[PDB]
Amino acid sequence: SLTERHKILHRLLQE
Amino acid sequence: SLTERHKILHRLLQEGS
Amino acid sequence: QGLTEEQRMMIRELMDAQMKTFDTTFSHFKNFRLPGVSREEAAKWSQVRKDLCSLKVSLQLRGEDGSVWNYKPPADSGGKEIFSLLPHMADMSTYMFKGIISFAKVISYFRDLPIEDQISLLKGAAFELCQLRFNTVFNAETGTWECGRLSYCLEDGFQQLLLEPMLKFHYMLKKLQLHEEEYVLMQAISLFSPDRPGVLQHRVVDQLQEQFAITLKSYIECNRPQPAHRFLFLKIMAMLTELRSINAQHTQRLLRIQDIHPFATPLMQELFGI
Amino acid sequence: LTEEQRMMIRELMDAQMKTFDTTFSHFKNFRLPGVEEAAKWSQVRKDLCSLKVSLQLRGEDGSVWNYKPPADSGGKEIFSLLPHMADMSTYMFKGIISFAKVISYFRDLPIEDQISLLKGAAFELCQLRFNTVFNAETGTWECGRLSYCLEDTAQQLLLEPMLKFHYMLKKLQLHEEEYVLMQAISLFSPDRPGVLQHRVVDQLQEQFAITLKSYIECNRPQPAHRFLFLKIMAMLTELRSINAQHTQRLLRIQDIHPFATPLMQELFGIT
Ligand SMILES: CCn1c([C@@H](C)NS(=O)(=O)c2ccc(Cl)cc2)nc2ccc(C(F)(F)F)cc21
Ligand SMILES: CCn1c([C@@H](C)NS(=O)(=O)c2ccc(Cl)cc2)nc2ccc(C(F)(F)F)cc21
Incomplete structure (x- = not known):
């Protein structure tokens, strides 16, 4: 749910 | 042929007011 | 103390034309551009660089909200940085020229002239009438032209600035402390110049200029008894002659700059023969 | 002084060098200021008299554009700098995210913890980085071609906690190594809301703190720096309080005048 509410941060963290 | 070489001025003068 | 009825009407029309076409607050000047946030050829550049000093x-x-944006131009570091303000200058001049065209259009004596002479007169006097109008918003104390929310401040002695003819013109004219009536009569005298190239009705124009000049001389006689205004009419007439010389000189700088760095708007190209 | 401590500092310094554009040469295309409800507005106006x-x-050609903000006149002038601020902050936050990403100790943490730590420390790491470009002599943050100068009021400035923070931190004259260890201590805060690996994070923070304390003992002569480590730790605690205060301000403004970028909305919990 936290990742779901933070897609941009999640994307930035995976690159 | 002043009018022909100064299209903008000509237009502005014709618009009046 | 007494102007003829014909003179009173002449001034009235001129003043009415000025009020209708001179947006002194520049509230309608918008959408203008702003500076971004061999051997013979090189000789042209040396000259161009000299023609941009002292224009600086x-x-x-000033925003409505009270905020302020200030732009300081770059020093001459030998390139195209010296042309940073030209697009803005072109927009300001074009805006002024349109107001000058409107001024001429509302004058009955101007409308009666053939379309060709209207064009010839405007081409010849656009710079002059613009500078006369700029003088009325010029603050001699601060060396700044106060154009509504826009202000143009001369780069910081006198003896040095007074070397630039246009600069000396502004200080000298401002010192005369002219009335609105005197400025508008100056504009009319400059507008109705019989000796502009291409004028055909040289006779009617010359006759009109004389009547505006007589009206100016009379206005001064009726309202300026103070010993501080001795020879005022003659000083004004001499300034108009000087302005005509400055016009020719600035026109030659414009073409020179245009030659190497085109920037004139289409209206400017028509007015100055580009 | 231990080899391990040396390696820890090296990784941190490497991360800082790779993710801190000190000349702000890559900060571009940003916005610039143009050329019960009543109770909310009243508070918001007060939240913006402190964001001046x-x-x-400074252009490449040598020209200079200078912007002076408007005085509080009533409405929709107090928000003139918000879009620019949003772009600067977002730019800073991206650099902070990159910083954390290159740290091995951070990457090993669960994705959810990485998110929780970044949300909690984004403001803090940004201010620590801003301190390194802060000129205490001129009261200006020198950000490459951009400069932000505080507009003096009729010790006065020392009243604003964030301003007092910057002068106080600058006065300590810290080394790059000490700034980066401060960033690590702030980043690996076990008490951020939403952290699950409290144990591991607390242990990591302690190791960074021990490293900082050791670095100071080894590199700084003695008496004058006797309590430097504790002064740093006290400043970090203060920054955490300032963070909470600024966050509240942000939400209040956002509520009445949305301006946060999508990344900011995620970092500070804005729907
Ligand atoms: C070339 C100097 N200049 C001039 C000349 C023709 N006359 S001036 O120097 O008396 C002057 C200077 C500034 C103003 Cl507003 C009016 C008159 N007009 C300008 C208008 C705008 C700007 C510029 F601001 F775009 F650079 C520069 C101008
Ligand atoms: C609201 C003041 N402020 C802050 C506060 C929270 N801290 S500060 O006053 O120490 C400060 C002020 C200016 C800078 Cl550049 C850095 C830190 N951070 C900002 C970042 C960018 C900009 C903005 F000017 F870009 F809008 C303004 C900022």
């Missing part, structure tokens, strides 16, 4: 002004934009 | 700075832009 800083620019100030 | 004049802005200076």
Whole structure:
């Protein structure tokens, strides 16, 4: 749910 | 042929007011 | 103390034309551009660089909200940085020229002239009438032209600035402390110049200029008894002759700059023969 | 002094060098200021009398654009600098995210923890980085071609906690190594809301703190720096309080005048 509410941060963290 | 070489001025003068 | 009825009506029309076409607050000047946030050829550049000094002004934009944007131009570091303010200058001049065209259009004596002479007169006097209008918003104390929310401040002695003819003109004219009536009569005298190239009704124009000059001389006689205004009419007439010389000189700088760095708007190209 | 401590500092310094554009050469295309409800507005107006700075832009050609903010006149002038602020902050936050990403100790943490730590420390790491470009002599943050100068009021400035923070931190004259260890201590805060691996994070923070304390003992002569480590730790605690305060301000403004970028909305919990 936290990742779901933070897609941009999640994307930035995976690159 | 002043009018022909100064299209903008000509237009502005014709618009009046 | 007494102007003829014909003179009173002449001034009235001129003043009415001025009020209707001179947006002194520049509230309608918008959407203008702003500076971004061999051997013979090189000789042209040396000259162009000399023609941009002393034009140098800083620019100030006061927002309605009370905020202020200030632009300081770059020093001559040998390139195209010296042309940073030209697009803005072109927009300001074009805006002024349109107001000058409108001024001429509302004058009955001007409308009666053939379309060709209207064009010839405007081409010849556009610079002059613009500078006369700029003088009324010129603050001699601060060396700044106060154009509504826009301010143009001369780059910081006197003896040095007084070397630039246009600069000396502004200080000298401002010192005369002219009335609105005197400025508008100056504009009319400059507008109705019989000796502009291409004028055909040279006779009617010459007759009109004389009547505006007589009206100016009379206005001064009726309202300026103070010993501080001795020879005022003659000083004004001499200033108009000087302005005509400055016009020719600035026109030659414009073409020179245009030759190397085109920037004139389409209206400017028509007015100055580009 | 231990080899392990040396390696820890090296990784941190490497991360900082790779992710801190000190000349702000890559900060571009940003916005610039144009050329019960009543109770909310009243508070918001007060939240913006404390977000004033004049802005200076030095062009490559040598020209200079200077922006002076408007005085509080009533409405929709107090928000003039918000879009620019949003772009600057977002730019800073991206650099902070990159910083954390290159740290091995951070990457090993669960994705959810990485998110929680970044949300909690984004403001803090940004301010620590801003301190390194802060000129205490001129009261200006020198950000490459951009400069932000505080507009003096009729010790006065020392009243604003964030301003007092910057002068106080600058006065300590810290080394790059000490700034980066401060960033690590702030980043690996076990008490951020939403952290699950409290144990591991607390242990990591302690190791960074021991490293900082050791670095100071080894590199700084003695008496004058006797309590430097504790002064740093006290400043970090203060920054955490300032963070909470600024966050509240942000939400209040956002509520009445949305301006946060999508990344900011995620970092500070804005729907
Ligand atoms: C070339 C100097 N200049 C001039 C000349 C023709 N006359 S001046 O120097 O008396 C002057 C200077 C500034 C103003 Cl506003 C009016 C008159 N007009 C300008 C208008 C705008 C700007 C510029 F601001 F775009 F640079 C520069 C101008
Ligand atoms: C609201 C003041 N402020 C802050 C506060 C929270 N801290 S500060 O006053 O120490 C400060 C002020 C200016 C800078 Cl550049 C850095 C830190 N951070 C900002 C970042 C960018 C800009 C903005 F000017 F870009 F809008 C303004 C900022």
